[PDB]
Write an enzyme that holds these catalytic residues in place. Sequence first.
Site, PDB file in Angstrom:
ATOM      1  N   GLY A  62      10.157 -25.807   7.648  1.00  0.00           N
ATOM      2  CA  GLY A  62      10.880 -25.176   8.017  1.00  0.00           C
ATOM      3  C   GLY A  62      11.955 -25.442   6.579  1.00  0.00           C
ATOM      4  N   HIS A  80       4.450 -23.667  -0.360  1.00  0.00           N
ATOM      5  CA  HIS A  80       5.087 -22.544  -0.060  1.00  0.00           C
ATOM      6  C   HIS A  80       5.994 -22.397  -0.372  1.00  0.00           C
ATOM      7  CE1 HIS A  80       7.625 -19.989   3.296  1.00  0.00           C
ATOM      8  NE2 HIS A  80       6.370 -18.784   2.299  1.00  0.00           N
ATOM      9  N   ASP A  93       4.446 -15.976   1.465  1.00  0.00           N
ATOM     10  CA  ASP A  93       4.276 -15.898   2.833  1.00  0.00           C
ATOM     11  C   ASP A  93       2.817 -15.670   3.496  1.00  0.00           C
ATOM     12  OD1 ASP A  93       7.372 -16.090   2.791  1.00  0.00           O
ATOM     13  OD2 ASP A  93       7.513 -14.413   3.299  1.00  0.00           O
TER      14      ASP A  93
HETATM   15  C1  LIG Z   1       8.415 -21.682   3.870  1.00  0.00           C
HETATM   16  C2  LIG Z   1       7.570 -21.763   4.778  1.00  0.00           C
HETATM   17  O1  LIG Z   1       6.025 -22.455   4.818  1.00  0.00           O
HETATM   18  C3  LIG Z   1       8.564 -22.368   6.200  1.00  0.00           C
HETATM   19  C4  LIG Z   1       7.817 -22.994   6.973  1.00  0.00           C
HETATM   20  C5  LIG Z   1       8.914 -22.591   8.305  1.00  0.00           C
HETATM   21  C6  LIG Z   1      10.706 -22.649   7.951  1.00  0.00           C
HETATM   22 BR1  LIG Z   1      11.263 -22.886   9.728  1.00  0.00          BR
HETATM   23  C7  LIG Z   1      11.322 -22.092   6.878  1.00  0.00           C
HETATM   24  C8  LIG Z   1      10.332 -21.516   5.521  1.00  0.00           C
END
Ligand SMILES: *CC(=O)c1ccc(Br)cc1
Lengths: 121, 121
Positions: B29, B47, B89
Amino acid sequence: SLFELGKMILQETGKNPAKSYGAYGCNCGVLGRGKPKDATDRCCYVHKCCYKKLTGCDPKKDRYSYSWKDKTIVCGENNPCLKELCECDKAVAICLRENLGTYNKKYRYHLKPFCKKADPC
Amino acid sequence: SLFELGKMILQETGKNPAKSYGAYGCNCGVLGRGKPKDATDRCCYVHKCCYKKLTGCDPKKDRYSYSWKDKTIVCGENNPCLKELCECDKAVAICLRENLGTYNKKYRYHLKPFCKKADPC
Ligand SMILES: *CC(=O)c1ccc(Br)cc1
Ligand SMILES: *CC(=O)c1ccc(Br)cc1
């Protein structure tokens, strides 16, 4: 920052901010704006428009000082950007509270890709 | 962008991305990283670390092309940043799927302010 914003939202609305507003309608949550789905969403639209005035501070990351006085959000520090930021956040928290009456769970994780393009602020 | 990321997460996990991962643990998030709460959270940590290599493209806003082929995410365009982004991603979507087995709803809107500071990537 999102920490202060979330706290303000919690203070005003009594709702878990991420759950209730982290992805609500076309404007509450990530990315930019979209045609609002309802009043709550419109709060968030107004709040993203408000962020547009910020120069030199990052609305997501930058902490600022505020306190809760007389069950009111009271923005502290005079740093112009941070204060503007704080006021934007205060305003959306108040606005979300004011519009709890029409809060609709169906918009909670609204499919933002289908949002209509936002008008200019 | 978050649109492609959310789509990838949906494609791999079959979960509403915002609901399941929009605020999960210390890393899934908003904002940055935190000591991961679990494997799912660690996916998101990895990530956000992956995003650190991106130059010239915005991981949140910038669209890129990918397709679903043989029920696999297949990143398209050669634009180096966008391709790296796409692969970050793809990796998190795969990782979140792989770790569905330990997904814990208690971390869904985990109080991120109490997260322990993330180690350097
Ligand atoms: C990068 C990642 O896994 C992630 C997950 C949820 C939200 Br919101 C933003 C990024
Ligand atoms: C600015 C605003 O009201 C908003 C709400 C939710 C998330 Br997430 C980000 C910003």
